[PDB]
Amino acid sequence: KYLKSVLRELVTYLLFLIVLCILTYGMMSSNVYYYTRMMSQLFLDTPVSKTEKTNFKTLSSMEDFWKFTEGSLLDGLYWKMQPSNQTEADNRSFIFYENLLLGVPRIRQLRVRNGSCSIPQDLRDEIKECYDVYSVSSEDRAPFGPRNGTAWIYTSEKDLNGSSHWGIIATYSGAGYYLDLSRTREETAAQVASLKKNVWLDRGTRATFIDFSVYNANINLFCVVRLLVEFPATGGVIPSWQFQPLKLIRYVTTFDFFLAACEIIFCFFIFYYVVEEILEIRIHKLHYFRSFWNCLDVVIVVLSVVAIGINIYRTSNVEVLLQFLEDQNTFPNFEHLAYWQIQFNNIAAVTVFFVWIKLFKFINFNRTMSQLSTTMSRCAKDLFGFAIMFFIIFLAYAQLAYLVFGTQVDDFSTFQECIFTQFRIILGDINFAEIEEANRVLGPIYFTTFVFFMFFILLNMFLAIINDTYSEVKSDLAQQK
Amino acid sequence: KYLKSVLRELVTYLLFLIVLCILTYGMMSSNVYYYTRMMSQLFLDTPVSKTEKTNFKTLSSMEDFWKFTEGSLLDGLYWKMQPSNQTEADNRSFIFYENLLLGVPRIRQLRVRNGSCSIPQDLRDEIKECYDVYSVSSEDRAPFGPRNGTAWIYTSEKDLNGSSHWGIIATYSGAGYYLDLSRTREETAAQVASLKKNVWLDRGTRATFIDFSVYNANINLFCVVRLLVEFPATGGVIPSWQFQPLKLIRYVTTFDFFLAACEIIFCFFIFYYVVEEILEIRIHKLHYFRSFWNCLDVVIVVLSVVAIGINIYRTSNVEVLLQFLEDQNTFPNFEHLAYWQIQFNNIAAVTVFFVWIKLFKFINFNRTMSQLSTTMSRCAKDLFGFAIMFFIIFLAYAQLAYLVFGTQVDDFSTFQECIFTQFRIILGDINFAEIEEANRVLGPIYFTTFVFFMFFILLNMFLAIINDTYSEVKSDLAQQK
Amino acid sequence: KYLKSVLRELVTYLLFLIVLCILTYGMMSSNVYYYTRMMSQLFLDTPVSKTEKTNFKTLSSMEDFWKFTEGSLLDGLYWKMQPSNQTEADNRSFIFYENLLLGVPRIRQLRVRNGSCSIPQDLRDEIKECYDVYSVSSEDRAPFGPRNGTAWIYTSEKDLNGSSHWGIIATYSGAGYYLDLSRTREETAAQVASLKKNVWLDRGTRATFIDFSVYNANINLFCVVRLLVEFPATGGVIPSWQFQPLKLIRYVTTFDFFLAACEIIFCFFIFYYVVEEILEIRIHKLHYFRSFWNCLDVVIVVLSVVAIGINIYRTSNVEVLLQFLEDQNTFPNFEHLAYWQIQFNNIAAVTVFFVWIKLFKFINFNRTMSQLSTTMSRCAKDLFGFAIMFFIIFLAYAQLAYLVFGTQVDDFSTFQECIFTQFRIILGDINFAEIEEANRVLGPIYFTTFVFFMFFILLNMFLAIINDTYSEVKSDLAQQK
Amino acid sequence: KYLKSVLRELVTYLLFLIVLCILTYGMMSSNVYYYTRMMSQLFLDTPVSKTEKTNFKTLSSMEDFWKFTEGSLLDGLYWKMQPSNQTEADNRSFIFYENLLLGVPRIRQLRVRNGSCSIPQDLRDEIKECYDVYSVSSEDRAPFGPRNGTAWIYTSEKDLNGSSHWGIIATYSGAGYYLDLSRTREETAAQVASLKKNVWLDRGTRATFIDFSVYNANINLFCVVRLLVEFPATGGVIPSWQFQPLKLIRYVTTFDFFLAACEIIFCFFIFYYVVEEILEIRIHKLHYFRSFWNCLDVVIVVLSVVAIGINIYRTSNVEVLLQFLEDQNTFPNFEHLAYWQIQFNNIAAVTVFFVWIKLFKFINFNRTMSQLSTTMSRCAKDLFGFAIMFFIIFLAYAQLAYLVFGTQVDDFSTFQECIFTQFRIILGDINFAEIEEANRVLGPIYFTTFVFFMFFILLNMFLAIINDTYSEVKSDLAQQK
Ligand SMILES: N[C@@H](CC1CCCCC1)[C@@H](O)CC(=O)O
Ligand SMILES: N[C@@H](CC1CCCCC1)[C@@H](O)CC(=O)O
Ligand SMILES: N[C@@H](CC1CCCCC1)[C@@H](O)CC(=O)O
Ligand SMILES: N[C@@H](CC1CCCCC1)[C@@H](O)CC(=O)O
Ligand SMILES: *[C@@H]1O[C@H](CO)[C@@H](O)[C@H](O)[C@H]1NC(C)=O
Ligand SMILES: *[C@@H]1O[C@H](CO)[C@@H](O)[C@H](O)[C@H]1NC(C)=O
Ligand SMILES: *[C@@H]1O[C@H](CO)[C@@H](O)[C@H](O)[C@H]1NC(C)=O
Ligand SMILES: *[C@@H]1O[C@H](CO)[C@@H](O)[C@H](O)[C@H]1NC(C)=O
Ligand SMILES: [Ca+2]
Ligand SMILES: [Ca+2]
Ligand SMILES: [Ca+2]
Ligand SMILES: [Ca+2]
Ligand SMILES: [Ca+2]
């Protein structure tokens, strides 16, 4: 009867569900974190460069930034090897021990043109210069300083093979200038001095990139490093960093022939429900119409295919075209080739999420629960459209926050970051130490009221409007009895 | 029909709402924070002055305070420029790079007269001296020390152009004495030594101000600095600081002619509803009477006008009268001219808040929500007058806290600060580390009971008295069905 | 009618309530905290004694303890004065500036007798010595070391004028030995060297006290210092400290003649309701019987009288008998004379607490609230006797905690401290960082379950059993309608 | 009547309950913690070895690990004695003062064989070497380096008397190599240099153990030390530590003859209910069937017996066979002999837990509570089987977390650790500082939704489905009235 068509479609998913759980552990090993954490804490937190305590994370002046380069990464990457002996002049070194350095770092940068901003008429004698915020129309393509080599010659975004980048305050694209690093300590050390001497950080500097990347021999894993040091147009500094691990070559002779052969099974397996599912979509137009459970049944397929192509289609031929392209003393473009990885990694996962809530309807046939799932199903039609009312007053304080503290407390800063903090307080966590220090009459009265209302309103609408309906429907499933 | 008069009044507000959202982003840029954070962490947290770790925030002795002045700000403000060359003897320098120093710092101070307090009769031989807490009748106008220059000559509050100030423990007004700083490092460095040598910090010193201010060339922004170092009458020290950014000249040739021309639209736009709304106020006396929604409809106008004048009326002619007044080597009074800014900034924002809850009644016409808004509308008549009962027992622990821990734990300190902590614990956050260390039999028994009752009473009254009414009214809107 | 007898009794309390609110602010000023915080952070957190970072709070070895004495307090108390000149050989100094040192410190100590514990028979050759935990029957009165001066001669508890003390692990009484400090730096510095040389800290040392005290000239306030450094019988060290501020002389010529004259009014005012209230107690035996509101009406009087005598009766004649007793170069006993202050301070406050909940019944006559106070009045008869059921399972985890983590995590430590942590987690706060590090299979499974049940049981019993009754009684006050 | 058989069985448990409460305090004293905390903070947090701040907990490089051994523990264990005199050449020393060192430390280690992993074909010329993750089939038994002494000769797991170990990433068994330490500072110091010189840490090193142990003369307590320093296969380092206190000799002449004589009473007392309880189990098969209260009545016995034997049966003859076995200059195996202690300690406690909830049914006969216990008894039949639905969506985010942040934030790391964090956030505690820094578009949207749903779903199902039933049953016990 049905049970054959019940389990058969289940048996697919029931078997299909284990497939990805393999990929999880399989495509990404569990200790991968302790790869970063090391690789992280090497180049971030640990200047001994002097008694100076300030690490990468804590940084202000530009000259420190110099002392950072030539004082840490310069000693981070370029330095001796395990035996100290046996004369390696071809691969001269890597960091230490179990990780391989490949290529050579690339320093990328932006700048904005002189007098891009007109000082108000009054001060025009008082001070000569102005450099305003970074923007496309404000970007500077003009050649610069003593013009020799690359970093003294502007280049187009498309000229380099690199892409744009997100960043925190201002998004950046292409390069104003760049310098690829030498593979030897000395010359790298030799440039930086010769590099500082010309001072291309003078003013108006905005984006500053440092890009190298490395390989792990042991578990094969392949990781990239982008250090972006922003400069606000107001004179400060914002440090930031991005560490992305990646597996490049898809084939590990041990476990992958199980995985990759199951990989092709996966894209085949969905190809089944690709067409199988559309048949009801084309044949029954309104039968699937107006079902949230069903309206979500498509999304899993929507996303999966996106993942499907981009891995092979985008990134497979990539992997090929780097062989000697990637290995030579020259530095590859590889970053953008991993751009999709992050793009992929999450959207790989996001699907996996929904895959469970698929089973949510199915294999719970048993108790009154199956009915008592309709209970929770009933509520939202009130609340799903209701939550605005709260969320309206919820944005209230949010925007009330920005305008008030936004110039002093950090946590609020933008509006996009300060929307969260008024969550993080509801669960609780506290900058309230320095809220007073911000504005004595306000920070109290904002906070005091907010925790009062929001934490005593969330009570109100939710719980009751939760409570009632269930009491009704559980009594309603009693009033069919 | 109505829909014409419905949308027309809406279209005003519906358009009016976007107007201010412009001002928000427009009148204050988003990165303004990263202006302070730099400008902050320069003069606060970062002595290298010796291996001494203690920054401004962590400070005790008076001689450190000296080592602070001549050791940090002295090197904070007065120091070299980007090229190090090209001979600037007119503007000799600013801090670094992208921020301009203007004027010159001013050190302001208070003191209290000798023997202002009568030691009890017994000890009168034991010790000679007494200086009691700062207060007006206890203030000292008497000339002091070797009398030369300004800071050895008292001045009246009105004599100087400055105003009073809030501060934490004691509010302060005017000046006992003052010294304007030199614009050169050396002479500033030269004074302080000559300044210490006379030791005008001897004892009884209470308020100590340091005031300079600076300008930002790049985005035009104009910021002021008040460092107040209090001295308790018990011998300690309280550091504190105030950083206020400001835009002064109202005209940025780029975006402002959009903003300022929309500014005049704004004050015009309210002028519409200024009179339009009073017509019903004068004609219908009792028709608007007794409506909370309507009773709040006035407040938005009440505040806005306050903001309206004070910006132009108070502060516009200000901006004018500083041109060469502000630029010359002499230091301006500008602080009070920004006093209203903070006064303004918030009260600008507070309105914006209410502007949303205006729409709260209007554009939700749709679901039973519009009715289900009457639900939440029903509750408070019980609770709004009820919340005292809690709040009564709520102050209980509060005042129970002060009398008990108030002499040992900091967090409680005053009553005004300790009213909050018994919130900050309900959401949760913890000094409970050192609560035991305060009083072993109490700190437990206060805390233990409090979290018990308050966190199990807030349950009680709220949720039920929330729950019921909705169950009734939702059934009442069912019992009109 | 009643309103005359209604307000008259009220007018007493209604006026009486303000009386104590004066005492609060009056008997204890608001800035008193910033007295300690200074006076605290001088002798606790701030060795510069070398580059060694370890302060008082962080301490291990005994020799550090030596370097603490002679390296900090030795420089804490004994050191120069404001002018550095004018030859004070009578009062040679105080700390700095605004606080007076009086008397001279006293070092007090305990020790336990040799071989107080019998090592098991096997090891008896392996190692010679044993010293067990401190206890009365294990206490050592035997004279000790080279016997000269005080600290080499035992003394009885009663011989010294001092009392016992609480402390954390073991309570202590009297003295094994003691040394009063010199008033001069040098000799104090001279002893300690001569003191170390004899090494009376050898082993078995348990309690170590350091006691001096100081006076504040300015606001008159009088503070005492007890530093107890425990030694566990296992070789460690436990630092601890006690700072008690006090006002001694009851008369400040300015504000006290208002306060003290109102003080005598207070003890008179209660003397009114002392007898006035007993009349109904004697005449009506069962009329007051079985009323919680009334059953609490006595407690306020119970405690107040306790406070009444002990201030004058215990501590007034004290204040007198210290005049030249307290001032002379010899050190007074004053500590115990302040013992009652803390004993008093709280029990002064605890009353004040209840004084509000007195008004709780009275001046709320108005809304249905007065009836709706009976609502909350109804609940507890279920819950007040119920809370055991939870509290039973609540102790469960508590004692489950001790036996499990108690030997590794600090936070649990005793049972008396670990009863709190399972609150502090419910509100939330976290050692959960090192819970895993303690026991990997447990710390999770304890924690995981606990937050599950306890935080999902507190839901259960409370809210519903809260909700229902009110829904009933509010409907019951509706069913009298 | 019943009351005789009611109390008699009670009187057993009612008396039995106190028995174990003795064991708690008795078998483990309260200050035992302050034994560890000292003994802990000696060898963990406190290098002065140079100005280098990095302690054991904060560690990266291998050479630091060397500087750790020879720089801390080398000075931790081996160093002078109280008198500095009286010539102890037999027991040469212990740490300090009140703790005895016995035996001598043992360094244990693992390694993995060369070329255990085949580098992909392409790079095979690029780099020569590979060492993959530790596993049994990947373990290396091959002899190593210059082969002399123990640590240059492999040994089997069974050859040594030691057992395997848990550890965090990889579990370890037996030894690749080992070296017992000398009892003298010098020779221990002498080896390490000679030890480093051979460099047996070269690469592929995984597990590194250091094992010594010590005795406490004073309270008799006997503690063991295992320091495991893991090496990831990716080049990092993971420090970790295990401190286990233990009492070995069961007889303390003072209090134990009360305890141990009550110990034999205990195992006798259960032997009563061992058989007494089985009689109803054999005679009534279905009468006990299907009672949760009764279904739990067996577990207490199930576990207790497990504890019963293993203490005497496993560990008693152990204690005997160490007398001169344990004392001699040679180092004993004692660790595994304490392996059961931890195994025992918890499972000793876990029983004690359930012992209370035994009384939960009994001595509450009194109020409607006894009936109102059936109320809470009613709920779970809905919820106990329900909690999956939540817990399903609960794992959702959990696994959604791993795949997303798992490569950057530490807190998530494995799946087994990241299941907790989504609790620790619900109660609240925050890495949300660096969540943004991980993935800007995700970390918000994960977090934002999660706190929304999970914290607004836990509301939903729980409270109502809690509320209703009680309202029904309390009305149902009213509808039997
Ligand atoms: N077999 C997978 C584990 C899960 C799949 C879902 C059903 C339960 C078992 C697999 O992920 C196991 C692993 O990767 O180690
Ligand atoms: N136009 C404003 C954005 C909001 C206004 C309210 C309606 C939705 C859109 C403006 O603030 C946009 C900006 O300042 O960038
Ligand atoms: N008059 C007191 C303030 C309170 C008393 C209670 C009624 C309201 C006013 C007094 O404490 C004021 C003061 O001490 O400053
Ligand atoms: N006699 C035990 C105390 C408890 C037992 C249970 C009933 C209440 C009293 C014993 O643990 C006391 C002690 O160990 O100090
Ligand atoms: C170009 O290279 C020469 C080589 O010495 C160097 O001196 C010069 O600085 C470079 N470019 C400029 C603009 O100086
Ligand atoms: C006044 O100026 C002179 C100039 O040298 C200086 O010496 C003196 O200290 C100043 N005033 C006093 C009171 O000393
Ligand atoms: C007693 O005083 C003398 C004075 O020099 C001192 O040497 C001695 O140490 C003191 N007591 C003992 C036991 O040494
Ligand atoms: C064996 O012992 C000798 C003794 O000096 C030492 O030199 C040698 O290093 C040891 N083993 C090896 C492999 O070197
Ligand atoms: Ca909560
Ligand atoms: Ca919380
Ligand atoms: Ca916290
Ligand atoms: Ca809640
Ligand atoms: Ca209900």
Q: Could you please report the per-residue DSSP string of C415-467? A: HHHHHHHHHHHHH----HHHHHHH-TTHHHHHHHHHHHHHHHHHHHHHHHHHH
Nearest CB partner across the interface for D410, out of A37, A345, A429: A37
Helix (H, G, I), strand (E, B), or coil: what is residue B202?
coil
Whether C129 sits inside 8 A of D217 (CB atoms) is: yes
Chain C residue numbers with beta carbons less than 8 Å from the beta carbon of B428 are 427-429
Cβ of residue C197 lying under 6 Å from some atom of ligand 7: no
Whether A349 sits inside 8 A of D389 (CB atoms) is: no
- Do residues C331 and C103 touch, judged by C-beta distance below 8 A? yes
* CB contact set of A188 (below 8 Å; sequence gap of 6+): A74, A78, A181, A182
Chain D residue numbers with beta carbons less than 8 Å from the beta carbon of A369 are 385-386, 389
Residue identifier of the C-alpha nearest atom 2 of ligand 5: A148
- Do residues B218 and A131 touch, judged by C-beta distance below 8 A? yes
- Do residues D406 and A33 touch, judged by C-beta distance below 8 A? yes
Residue at token pair 């985005």: B219
DSSP code, position C366: S
Task: Give distance in angstroms: CA of B70 to centre of ligand 6.
Answer: 20
**What are φ and ψ of residue A62, in 5° steps?**
-70, -40
Q: What is the rounded CA–CA span in Å between residue C276 and residue C5?
A: 14
Q: Of the candidates A110, A119, A116, A153, which has an alpha carbon nearest to the alpha carbon of residue A132?
A: A116
Q: What is the rounded CA–CA span in Å between residue B123 and residue C168?
A: 37
Residue identifier of the C-alpha nearest atom 1 of ligand 7: C148
Nearest CB partner across the interface for B24, out of A129, A403, A441: A403
Q: Is C343 annotated as a binding residue?
A: yes
Cβ of residue B30 lying under 6 Å from some atom of ligand 6: no
Beta strands, E only, D262-309: none
Partners of A246 in the β-ladder: A222
Partners of B246 in the β-ladder: B222
* CB contact set of C200 (below 8 Å; sequence gap of 6+): C109, C111, C144, C145, C151, C152, C177
* Residue of chain A minimizing CA distance to B243: A408
* Residue of chain C minimizing CA distance to B387: C369
This structure's resolution (Å) is 4.2
List the chains bordering chain C where 3 or more Cβ pairs fall under 8 Å. Answer: B, D
Partners of D204 in the β-ladder: none
Task: Give distance in angstroms: CA of A442 to centre of ligand 3.
Answer: 24
Query: Which of C121, C138, C392, C460 to substitute to test the interface with D, most D CBs within 10 Å?
Result: C460
Q: How many CA atoms lie within 13 A of C66 on its CB side?
A: 16
**Residue type (1 letter), C448:** T
- How far is the alpha carbon of A253 from chain B, nearest alpha carbon, in Å? 51
Contacts of the segment D290-293: beta carbons below 8 A, 24+ positions apart: D293/D361
CA dihedral D10, D11, D16, D22 (to 10 degrees): 130
- How far is the alpha carbon of C338 from chain B, nearest alpha carbon, in Å? 15
Q: What is the rounded CA–CA span in Å between residue A379 and residue C122?
A: 74
Q: CA dist B373 to A464, B380, B467, D456, Å?
A: 14, 13, 15, 20
Query: Which of B125, B403, B441, B446 to substitute to test the interface with C, most C CBs within 10 Å?
Result: B403
* Token representation of residue A214: 């490395």
Whether C34 sits inside 8 A of B120 (CB atoms) is: no
Q: Of the candidates A26, A25, A29, which has an alpha carbon nearest to the alpha carbon of residue A218?
A: A29
Nearest CB partner across the interface for A428, out of D393, D428, D456: D428
Q: What is the rounded CA–CA span in Å between residue A355 and residue A349?
A: 10
**Residue type (1 letter), C441:** V
Q: Is A296 annotated as a binding residue?
A: no
Whether B236 sits inside 8 A of C37 (CB atoms) is: yes
Q: Of the candidates A218, B284, B110, which has an alpha carbon nearest to the alpha carbon of residue D205?
A: A218
Beta strands, E only, B60-216: 99-109, 177-180, 208-216
**Residue type (1 letter), C253:** T
Nearest ligand, CA of residue B430?
Answer: 11
Q: What is the rounded CA–CA span in Å between residue D155 and residue D162?
A: 11
Helix (H, G, I), strand (E, B), or coil: what is residue A243?
strand
Atom of ligand 2 nearest to the CA of B17: 6
- Do residues A33 and A41 touch, judged by C-beta distance below 8 A? no
Nearest ligand, CA of residue A16?
Answer: 1
* Token representation of residue A356: 């469970």
Q: What is the rounded CA–CA span in Å between residue A17 and residue A39?
A: 34
- Do residues C373 and B389 touch, judged by C-beta distance below 8 A? yes
- Do residues D251 and D220 touch, judged by C-beta distance below 8 A? no
Chain A residue numbers with beta carbons less than 8 Å from the beta carbon of D232 are 31, 34-35, 38
Percentage helix, strand, coil, to 5, in chain A? 55, 10, 35
Task: Give distance in angstroms: CA of C202 to centre of ligand 7.
Answer: 18
- Do residues D353 and C396 touch, judged by C-beta distance below 8 A? yes
Task: Give distance in angstroms: CA of D427 to centre of ligand 9.
Answer: 7
Task: Give distance in angstroms: CA of A97 to centre of ligand 4.
Answer: 58
Chain B residue numbers with beta carbons less than 8 Å from the beta carbon of C35 are 232, 234, 236
Cβ of residue C148 lying under 6 Å from some atom of ligand 7: yes
**What are φ and ψ of residue A253, in 5° steps?**
-55, -20
Chain C residue numbers with beta carbons less than 8 Å from the beta carbon of B444 are 420
Method: cryo-EM
* Token representation of residue D11: 């009187």
Side by side, which strands form the sheet with A208-216? A177-180, A99-109, A208-216, A222-230, A238-246
**Residue type (1 letter), A248:** L
* CB contact set of B183 (below 8 Å; sequence gap of 6+): B92, B104, B329
Chain C residue numbers with beta carbons less than 8 Å from the beta carbon of D372 are 382, 386
Q: What is the rounded CA–CA span in Å between residue B28 and residue C450?
A: 48
- Give burial (CB, 10 Å; 0-12/13-18/19+) of B82: middle
Q: Considering Cα of A357, then A362, then A366, then A367, what sign does the dihedral take?
A: positive
- How far is the alpha carbon of A121 from chain D, nearest alpha carbon, in Å? 41
- How far is the alpha carbon of B129 from chain C, nearest alpha carbon, in Å? 8
Side by side, which strands form the sheet with B222-230? B177-180, B99-109, B208-216, B222-230, B238-246
Atom of ligand 4 nearest to the CA of D25: 14
* Token representation of residue A159: 């000229």
Q: CA dist B327 to A131, A246, B187, B216, C379, Å?
A: 21, 57, 20, 14, 72
Cβ of residue B146 lying under 6 Å from some atom of ligand 6: yes
Task: Give distance in angstroms: CA of B21 to centre of ligand 2.
Answer: 5
Whether C448 sits inside 8 A of D99 (CB atoms) is: no
Chain C residue numbers with beta carbons less than 8 Å from the beta carbon of B463 are 463, 466-467
Task: Give distance in angstroms: CA of D194 to centre of ligand 8.
Answer: 9
Between helix B335-362 and helix B2-27 the angle, nearest 10°, is: 150
Whether B97 sits inside 8 A of A430 (CB atoms) is: no
List the chains bordering chain D where 3 or more Cβ pairs fall under 8 Å. Answer: A, C
- How far is the alpha carbon of C118 from chain B, nearest alpha carbon, in Å? 35
Task: Give distance in angstroms: CA of B23 to centre of ligand 2.
Answer: 9
| Number of Cβ atoms within 10 Å of the Cβ of B18 | 8
Query: Which of C126, C205, C407 to substitute to test the interface with D, most D CBs within 10 Å?
Result: C407
| Ligand 4 pocket at CB < 6 A | D 17-18, 21-22, 25
Q: What is the rounded CA–CA span in Å between residue D103 and residue D337?
A: 15
Q: Of the candidates C372, B474, C382, C375, which has an alpha carbon nearest to the alpha carbon of residue D470?
A: C382
- Do residues C144 and C154 touch, judged by C-beta distance below 8 A? yes
